[PDB]
């Protein structure tokens, strides 16, 4: 991919790559959940 | 180049497509939610 390029490995410091990895791992969990929370709210709204 | 970080880099991109994907699914739920409103 576009991001799979070597220029990025060189360009970013290792301290940034490490930070990037850790944030997105937590992020994705919230993203699936927003669908689940709203859906839960739709069922809640019918009551 | 090829490195283990290159694969990690590829993986960062896929969450962004999901970020979009989830806003789209959330929209649909919102249209049915409006009907209950």
For residues A42 and B33, the answer to whether their CB atoms sit within 8 Å is: yes
Which of A:11-30 have CB within 8 Å of B?
Answer: 17, 20-21, 24, 27-28
Overall residue count recorded for chain A in this entry: 47
Tell whether B34 is within 8 A of chain A (Cβ): no
3-state secondary structure A1-39: CCCCCCHHHHHCCHHHHHHHHHHHHHHHHHHHHHHHHHH
**Resolution in A, one decimal?**
12.3
For residues B22 and A35, the answer to whether their CB atoms sit within 8 Å is: yes
């Amino acid at each position: 991919e576009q991001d799979g390029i070597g220029e990025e490995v060189l360009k970013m410091s290792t301290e940034e790559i490490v930070q990037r990895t850790r944030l997105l791992d937590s992020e994705i969990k919230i993203m699936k959940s927003e669908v689940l929370r709203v859906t839960h709210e739709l069922q809640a709204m019918k009551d | 180049m090829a490195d283990p970080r290159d694969k990690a880099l590829q993986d960062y991109r896929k969450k962004l497509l999901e970020h979009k994907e989830i806003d789209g699914r959330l929209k649909e739920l919102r249209e049915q939610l409006k009907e209950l409103t």
